[PDB]
Every structure is written in structure tokens, then in C-alpha cells.
Amino acid sequence: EPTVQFFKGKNGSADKVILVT
Amino acid sequence: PSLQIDIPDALSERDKVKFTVHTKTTLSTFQSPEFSVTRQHEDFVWLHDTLTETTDYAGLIIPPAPTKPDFDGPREKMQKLGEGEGSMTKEEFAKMKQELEAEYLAVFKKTVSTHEVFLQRLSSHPVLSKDRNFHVFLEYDQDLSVRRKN
């Protein structure tokens, strides 16, 4: 049911995922 | 450098995986110098198969289609993780949720890479980068569902 959202890291930041409510 | 594509983010929803396809171009063959669309994995598969089944393109070095990302594992763990929230302690819930996020992260990084490289290889190809369907894939705002059915 929920969705998982991914974000590419920019400016040296680390890529991460977010569990969406 | 006239046609540059990247994937800044991605999303797993139910059994579908959506990619944000971001394009920066100096070519006036595109309506806008910068634009983004949403594409499912199925759209990538459709793009590749459409190129390969173009008889004029038969023989061309067509880059391989990205494989389907596997979120079945993480999706099962996540939902079953969710049911036990009331029962579960409030200390280990974040423990294996963080471990679950890390599992999603591993899959995402890999599949985003494969999908992005697929598009970047198409952009550098002198014949394929001018293809009508490749153009549609990058620029067409709406969902590709109907154009994949006709």
C-alpha cells in the first residue's frame, strides 16, 4: 500500500530512500 | 552535450516503479531546452523493443534494455513490518525499518543506474537519438499506456 521514494544525491550528498506516509 | 539525460529520482509504488526522466538539450528539435517526464519500467522495455523491431534499425548496435527491478522482497518485508507496529517494540521497529530502507536503497541505486545508462547510450547514438519514439519517451507529458496499446 505505501510507496517508497528514492532520491539521487547531489553535491556530494548520499542517495537515500523515503518511506511515504 | 546537445542531448543530456539523467534520472534524479525514482519511486516504488505497489508493483510499479516510476522513474523521473530529466533532459537538458540545446537541440531545437525538442520543444523545450529543459523538461522532465514520468516513465515506468514498462516504458523503457517498450522503447527498446520498438527500436529493435524497426526494420531499418536491424543491425545497429542497440544498447540492451534495462532489466526489471526486483522490489518483491523489500515490499513483502516492509508491509509485514508495518502490521507488527503495534506489537513491535518502539526500539527495534526503527532498527529493521532502517535495515529495510537500506535494502530499498541497494535496489534503487542499481536499477536507476541501468535505466539511466540505457538512455544516455541512446542519446549518443547518431541514428537512435533522432528516433521518433525516443523523442516521445523523453518529451510526451501524459502516460504512455495508450500509445503502448495501439
| Residue for grid cell 547510450 | B121
Q: Write out the CATH class of domain B1-150.
A: alpha beta
Q: CA nearest B122: which of B132, B112, B110?
A: B132
Measure the CA–CA gap between B27 and B23, rounded to whole angstroms.
Answer: 11
Q: Is B9 annotated as a binding residue?
A: no
Q: Is B72 annotated as a binding residue?
A: yes
Burial class (CB in 10 A: 0-12, 13-18, 19+), A11: exposed
Backbone torsions φ then ψ of B19, nearest 5 degrees: -110, 140
Residue B60: Cβ within 10 Å count: 14
Measure the CA–CA gap between B2 and B27, rounded to whole angstroms.
Answer: 6
Measure the CA–CA gap between B25 and B94, rounded to whole angstroms.
Answer: 43
Backbone torsions φ then ψ of B132, nearest 5 degrees: -60, -45
Which residues contact residue B12 at a Cβ distance below 8 angstroms, ignoring those fewer than 6 apart? A3, A4, A5, A6, B18, B69, B71, B74, B75, B104, B108
Measure the CA–CA gap between B110 and B126, rounded to whole angstroms.
Answer: 27
Breaks (C-N over 2.5 A) in chain B follow: none
Residue B85: Cβ within 10 Å count: 10
The minimum CA-CA distance between A10 and chain B, rounded to whole Å, is 9
Residue A14: Cβ within 10 Å count: 8
Best B105, B113, B115, B116 residue to mutate vs chain A (most A CBs within 10 Å): B105
Resolution of the experimental model, in Å, one decimal: 2.3
| Residue B53 in grid coordinates | 523491431
Residue B103: Cβ within 10 Å count: 17
Give the DSSP H or E segment for B35.
Answer: strand B34-40
| Residue B111 in grid coordinates | 536499477
Backbone torsions φ then ψ of B39, nearest 5 degrees: -135, 130
| Residue B110 in grid coordinates | 542499481
Backbone torsions φ then ψ of B13, nearest 5 degrees: -135, 115
A1 CB neighbours in chain B (<8 A) are: 14, 79
8 A C-beta contact, residue B118 and residue B134: no
Measure the CA–CA gap between B102 and B74, rounded to whole angstroms.
Answer: 10
Which residues contact residue B11 at a Cβ distance below 8 angstroms, ignoring those fewer than 6 apart? A3, A4, A5, A6, B17, B18, B19
B9 CB neighbours in chain A (<8 A) are: 5-8
